[PDB]
Design a protein around this ligand. Structure first.
Ligand SMILES: OC[C@H]1O[C@H](O[C@H]2[C@H](O)[C@@H](O)[C@@H](O[C@H]3[C@H](O)[C@@H](O)[C@@H](O[C@H]4[C@H](O)[C@@H](O)[C@@H](O[C@H]5[C@H](O)[C@@H](O)[C@@H](O[C@H]6[C@H](O)[C@@H](O)[C@@H](O)O[C@@H]6CO)O[C@@H]5CO)O[C@@H]4CO)O[C@@H]3CO)O[C@@H]2CO)[C@H](O)[C@@H](O)[C@@H]1O
Ligand SMILES: OC[C@H]1O[C@H](O[C@H]2[C@H](O)[C@@H](O)[C@@H](O[C@H]3[C@H](O)[C@@H](O)[C@@H](O[C@H]4[C@H](O)[C@@H](O)[C@@H](O)O[C@@H]4CO)O[C@@H]3CO)O[C@@H]2CO)[C@H](O)[C@@H](O)[C@@H]1O
Ligand SMILES: OC[C@H]1O[C@H](O[C@H]2[C@H](O)[C@@H](O)[C@@H](O[C@H]3[C@H](O)[C@@H](O)[C@@H](O[C@H]4[C@H](O)[C@@H](O)[C@@H](O)O[C@@H]4CO)O[C@@H]3CO)O[C@@H]2CO)[C@H](O)[C@@H](O)[C@@H]1O
Ligand SMILES: OC[C@H]1O[C@H](O[C@H]2[C@H](O)[C@@H](O)[C@@H](O[C@H]3[C@H](O)[C@@H](O)[C@@H](O)O[C@@H]3CO)O[C@@H]2CO)[C@H](O)[C@@H](O)[C@@H]1O
Ligand SMILES: [Mg+2]
Length: 755
């Protein structure tokens, strides 16, 4: 390019910057092609073009002007790229603002969609505000190969779609532009199918929806509703290894943490809206908005000292009772709690407080609700047609045909959508086994094997590995967490080593062992010492997340205090002990709302949490305890930097099962960071209990769960103890401790202390 062309851009004299900016073909070779990407980034001193699916990065050179950049690349096709932009000392990664000339689908868009590789198909399918033939309007587009006709119905045409019949393209996608309408437009797709029957359907790629039980889609100008502020956060994420950082997740179901009065409107960000009543049986109650939650949930979480919030699903879902796990609008956050901008606001604010957001994501199945994807075009479009692989009969739900390109594309792009438009920091996937196995919840004669006669679901595995490959490529530094409950190997290991590509897996065995353990009378724990110690045999085969989730305090399993035997005092001590042992055991951490203040009732998705308990000491003491434990978690690198390496953990002694006692070390880079952890899992205190340590010195009591201010009896070691030249559990020096009742001690060597 010439300097005249650049100056036209710089001084706002150029007629159409799309001629010059963005990606442009220069020439075609035998094997490959020469492209140039061009960018005008004011205030940027440097820029690169990332080709994350190819694992490459090229620098852009300033050209004719310091903020005008060109960068030439040879590669056959250049569909997938981002720009990294440096502005002083900060860097952001973003998609090219000049990627798409026009709002309609190009040959290239469609071609890619049909291979199932259009990672930004959500820019073209759905409904989008744009200009065509010189008029502002909305472009609508939908995948429906076998429909006989489709039309767009909505507010703008009194739900009569005769003047709004869509044009079928390439035998696959229906489109229509509608002028003069824009964002706020309420709409659906009238579809007539193969056999003449005419249903009405929500937009699969819709970005907003009416409040349930209504299902019409709404048009959103998704790129012009919210200003973000989290460039710093995103940069820190992109450049860090979340595996070597503290991760304590507060697990939350938004619709049931706290409610408000239906007697008043729901405040949004600079706006307000009608209240969403929580049930016809609790009509005085309303949901809080994403806006109100950002004001209340975030400071609560920040104070408690959790590093993350993990949401039960928030994709639009029609029945509160599914908890979210049965989704019908994959590409819209639920309208229960307000508008997309309001959720954007929530995430921005989590980030402003250095808290990340993880989203429960539901790619495994969808419900038969007819407004949704089921039998979309009058065929088995999204779901497989064989019910032996396309239904989950016990659940009454449909399974996506992962081998069908446009279906795979729907989900792969959807995951990418949430990181893109909503800036989220990770995902969790429920019940991965449901995807992996071709015989999941099926009995003999009722399922067909793969082509090699295995039970493995080849298409599902491919899909999961694509998801995790792309996600880490486009957004490094994120968390992809899996619950998979069947010994399937390498779940949280890399795709190149034949993993599924998650970087964390819920340790379900641990959970079961821990809760089964704590549930047993203390006297009898001596027969079950192996619940404590078993986990560490298999531990290092995966990067484990230690979760005590929502699923464990429903369906008459009781809340955590409920599971514990003994009187009220012992009940609380068992919680402190379990959770202190959890925060010291190797792994990342997850716990669910209400666990942190001792809720007695099981979690009930139809009400909010029993917040009135916080007005009584025991609950407040327990909440303080969790506040201090989180604070310690974050301040003690031996507790997070080597979670997944041998160096990080070694048992001191776990053989005194008659007293249910176990002891261990945790380690970091620095040897002065090493911790001694001593657990006593019965109400019997111990007066002169010797533990072996590896070095002489004063060991400080860093933490002691029996402290008075946590509800404990206040037995302990008065702040620390001098080690002895006295060999024990195979170590040179040793400690003669007071072990408090149902308690855990965390001690650290202070090598700069006065003998
Ligand atoms: O996260 C929770 C919380 O945990 C820790 O603090 C708690 C601590 O673990 C717990 O034991 C207690 O400690 C308090 C204590 O309540 C106070 O009384 C005060 O203790 C002083 C004590 O009054 C003095 O007697 C003096 O102790 C002397 C002993 O009297 C001597 O006999 C000798 O002790 C030896 C003992 O007799 C023998 O059996 C031998 O085998 O071993 C002993 C070695 O000590 O020497 C001591 C040393 O002076 O001095 C005490 C210190 O002033 O203060 C204690 C510490 O605050 O309650 C704590 C709070 O609930 C953790 O340290 C906190 O950071 C953390 O917040
Ligand atoms: O007049 C045009 C033709 O119309 C009819 O064929 C249709 C099908 O009925 C449609 O449902 C559609 O099917 C696509 C499908 O959408 C797409 O995913 C892809 O399917 C792949 C699949 O991903 C892959 O895993 C493997 O199974 O192979 C499949 C086949 O390639 O492609 C399908 C077929 O193109 O497309 C056409 C066109 O609308 C009619 O039956 C034809 O006889 C007729 O010529
Ligand atoms: O200093 C006096 C005593 O010190 C030590 O007692 C310990 C116990 O060994 C621990 O088990 C624990 O006691 C708990 C007890 O386990 C729990 O069930 C509960 O019992 C209370 C009860 O709630 C209360 O209403 C009434 O029954 O009194 C009981 C108290 O004895 O609560 C206890 C804690 O308050 O902690 C104590 C104190 O550290 C020591 O072992 C005893 O020899 C000694 O007498
Ligand atoms: O004040 C008018 C009216 O508006 C609200 O209902 C709207 C719903 O959001 C929506 O479902 C849509 O209704 C259409 C259906 O979606 C469609 O499938 C088909 O059956 O036609 C319907 C319109 O005739 O739009 C309605 C109407 O605006 C509100 O909930 C109503 O109670 C209120 O009376
Ligand atoms: Mg309530």
């Amino acid at each position: 390019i010439s300097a005249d062309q650049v100056n036209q851009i710089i001084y706002n004299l150029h007629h159409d910057p799309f001629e010059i900016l963005g990606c442009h073909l220069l020439e075609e070779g035998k094997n490959t092609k020469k492209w140039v990407v061009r960018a005008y980034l004011p205030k940027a001193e440097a820029a690169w073009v990332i080709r994350p699916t190819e694992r490459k990065e090229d620098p852009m050179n300033s050209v004719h002007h310091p903020n005008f950049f060109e960068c030439i690349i040879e590669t056959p096709e250049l569909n997938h790229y981002q720009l990294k932009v440096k502005e002083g000392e900060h860097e952001k990664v973003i998609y090219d603002p000049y990627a798409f000339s026009s709002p309609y689908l190009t040959d290239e868009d469609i071609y890619l969609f049909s291979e199932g590789n259009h990672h930004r198909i959500y820019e073209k399918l759905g409904a989008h505000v744009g200009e065509i033939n010189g008029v502002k309007g909305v472009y609508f587009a939908v995948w429906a190969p076998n429909a006989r006709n489709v039309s767009v119905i909505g507010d703008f045409n009194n739900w009569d779609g005769r003047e709004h019949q869509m044009r079928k393209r390439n035998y696959t996608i229906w489109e229509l532009f509608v002028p003069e309408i824009g964002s706020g437009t309420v709409y659906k797709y009238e579809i007539k199918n193969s056999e003449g029957h005419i249903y009405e359907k929500s937009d699969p790629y819709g970005f907003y929806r009416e409040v349930r039980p209504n299902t019409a889609s709404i048009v959103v100008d998704i790129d012009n509703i919210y200003q973000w502020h989290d460039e710093e956060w995103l940069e820190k994420r992109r450049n860090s290894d979340p595996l070597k950082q503290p991760v304590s997740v507060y697990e939350v179901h938004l619709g049931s943490w706290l409610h408000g009065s239906s007697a008043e409107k729901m405040p949004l960000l600079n706006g307000e809206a009608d209240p969403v009543i929580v049930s016809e049986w609790n009509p005085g109650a309303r949901f809080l908005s994403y806006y109100e939650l950002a004001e209340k949930l975030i400071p609560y979480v920040k104070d408690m000292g959790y590093t993350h919030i993990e949401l039960l699903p928030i994709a639009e879902h029609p029945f509160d009772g599914s908890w979210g796990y049965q989704v019908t609008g994959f590409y819209s956050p639920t309208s229960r709690f307000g508008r997309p901008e309001d959720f954007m606001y929530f995430v921005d604010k989590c980030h402003e407080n250095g808290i990340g957001v993880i989203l429960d994501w539901v790619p495994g199945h969808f419900p038969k609700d007819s407004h949704g994807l089921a039998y979309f075009d009058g065929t088995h479009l999204y779901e497989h047609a064989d019910p032996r692989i396309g239904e989950h009969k016990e659940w009454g739900t449909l399974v996506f045909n992962y081998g069908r390109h446009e279906v795979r594309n729907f989900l792969v792009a959807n995951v990418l959508f949430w990181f893109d438009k909503y800036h989220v920091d990770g995902i969790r996937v429920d019940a991965v086994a449901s995807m992996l196995y071709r015989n999941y919840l099926r009995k003999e004669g009722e399922w067909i094997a793969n082509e090699y006669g295995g039970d493995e679901h080849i298409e599902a595995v491919s899909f999961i590995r694509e998801v995790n490959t792309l996600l880490f490529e486009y957004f490094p530094g994120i968390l992809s967490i899996a619950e998979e409950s069947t010994e399937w190997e390498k779940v949280s290991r890399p795709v190149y080593d034949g993993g599924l590509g998650f970087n964390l897996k819920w340790d379900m065995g641990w959970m079961h062992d821990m809760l089964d353990y704590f549930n047993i009378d203390p006297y009898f724990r001596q027969y079950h010492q192996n619940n404590v110690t078993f986990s560490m045999l298999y531990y290092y085969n995966e990067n484990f997340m230690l979760a005590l989730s929502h699923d464990e305090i429903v369906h008459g399993k009781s809340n955590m205090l409920g599971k514990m035997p003994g009187d009220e005092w012992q009940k609380y001590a068992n919680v402190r002990a379990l959770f202190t042992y959890m925060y010291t055991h190797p792994g990342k951490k997850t716990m669910f709302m209400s666990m942190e203040f001792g809720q007695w009732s099981e979690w009930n998705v139809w009400g909010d949490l029993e917040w009135h308990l916080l007005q009584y000491e025991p609950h407040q003491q327990l909440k303080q305890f969790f506040t201090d434990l989180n604070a310690l978690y974050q301040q003690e690198p031996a507790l997070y930097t080597h979670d997944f390496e041998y160096h990080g953990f070694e048992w001191i002694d776990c053989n005194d099962n008659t007293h249910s006692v176990v002891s261990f070390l945790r380690r970091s880079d620095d040897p002065n960071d090493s911790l001694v952890v001593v657990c006593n899992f019965t109400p019997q205190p111990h007066s002169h209990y010797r533990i072996g340590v590896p070095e002489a010195g004063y060991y400080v009591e860093l933490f002691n769960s029996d402290a008075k201010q946590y509800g404990g009896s206040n037995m302990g070691n008065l702040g620390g103890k001098w080690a002895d030249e006295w060999s024990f559990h195979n170590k040179p020096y040793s400690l003669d401790l007071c072990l408090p009742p149902l308690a855990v001690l965390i001690l650290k060597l202070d090598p700069t202390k006065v003998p």
